[PDB]
Symmetry: C3
Subunit: 149 residues, 3 copies
């Protein structure tokens, strides 16, 4: 039984030119790329993305930092929502575990490279916000017999 | 004092073609390759290898998943039995620590890439099961003065 | 607000020829090289470097193992003193967390690849010990906007 999560490379991931390295970390576990799109995030879409943080003092600066090129992604795998969060590490890179993306690449929460859905509910909502359905691709990995039980 | 452990790349490690990456992780710590052999594991030898799991519900499926090409290895180093187990990570990849082999490469316990001895007694037994003594090679690493105290 | 820490590649890092890999780990987080110098450490400077261990049993052997080529480094970043210590891992490689330098490269405390300042006071002292002020270089990373909040 697999699930899908929404992962987004933030503008610092694009500008520091580590997109391929990020993707390789998820491919290495046999997670399937179900969707991938480069766009430029705008305030209106970012306000919906970060709707839970509406009204807060730190939202305007977050929206400014996120206004930039992003790579929207959907990955599929066993427990991939929680696992992708674990692989990203803590929001604050200084608290993130060695070997996580944020610990290996970053210094501060405001420039922490990547976003990942925090729950099944947020994954459904975020995939619907950033992708049209035709952009979610269904296919099977040829190495499935060696990735799954 | 150094010891020797038995490490085996399972058929998923062969088929996903990550043998070299696995070997490099152990070489990186200055662990010495003392033996290495590609074979195809058969139920009879696997039954002896996994004798501690006799009767357990997962054993028949484990033997099936392990019937395939494997790379038998012996590595030598300080505390290498416990250390290699730490590098492998937990049986479940989802529970394994970031930076371990199972967390970095795998999703599920039944396809978790690598076996390693869990104790001095099991290392002795497993090395003897899979290797004849003439297959164990003794040499000294040229960088020994910079690896060992 | 950034700070500067003193990092030193020990003779085993030089001789095992992993200098570039070590530097890449710190560059990967956007830490800035503020100073760098290859020298051959002498007992006199090592006595002052390791003054806190004066009288201790392992000191003379530590000085001996450290009498050789070293790479003196100063790296700048947010919380970089504590963060570089986290990235190095525990003194004993066998106790260091997976994904740290010492866990990924080493076996024993006497050959654990790298030194890093352990506090703000020690970083100031160690930088001044190994570098003259003229050797410390001030410049801005062009990716600063994508590294720092
Ligand atoms: N105190 C803070 N200072 C700067 N940026 C923050 C702070 N808190 C959150 N952020 C930013 O907002 C993003 C979304 O917030 P949140 O959902 O709490 O974290 P995460 O993305 O780890 O789930 C974070 O990834 C981070 O970039
Ligand atoms: N509940 C399970 N489901 C699927 N596979 C399992 C399960 N328990 C064990 N296994 C498989 O059997 C192998 C041997 O089990 P065990 O010796 O307990 O683990 P380890 O290899 O971590 O020492 C594991 O590496 C794993 O591939
Ligand atoms: N018990 C020990 N055995 C061998 N070498 C040691 C031991 N303790 C310390 N050392 C060596 O002395 C160095 C300095 O010791 P210390 O300052 O306590 O560790 P660290 O470098 O982790 O801060 C260590 O990096 C290590 O090379
Ligand atoms: Mg969030
Ligand atoms: Mg076992
Ligand atoms: Mg110290």
């Amino acid at each position: 039984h697999v699930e899908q999560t929404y992962l987004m490379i933030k503008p610092d991931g694009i500008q520091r030119q580590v997109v391929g390295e990020i993707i390789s970390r998820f491919e290495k576990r046999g997670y399937r790329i179900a969707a991938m799109k480069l766009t430029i995030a705008t305030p209106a879409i970012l306000e919906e993305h970060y709707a839970e943080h509406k009204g807060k003092p730190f939202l305007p600066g977050l929206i400014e930092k996120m206004t930039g090129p992003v790579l929207c992604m959907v990955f599929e795998g066993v427990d991939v929502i929680a696992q992708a969060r674990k692989m990203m590490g803590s929001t604050r890179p200084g608290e993130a575990a060695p070997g996580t993306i944020r610990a290996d690449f970053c210094q501060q929460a405001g420039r922490n490279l990547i976003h990942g859905s925090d729950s099944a509910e947020s994954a459904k909502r975020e995939i619907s916000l950033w992708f049209k359905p035709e952009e979610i691709q269904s296919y099977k990995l040829a190495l499935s017999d060696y990735i799954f039980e």
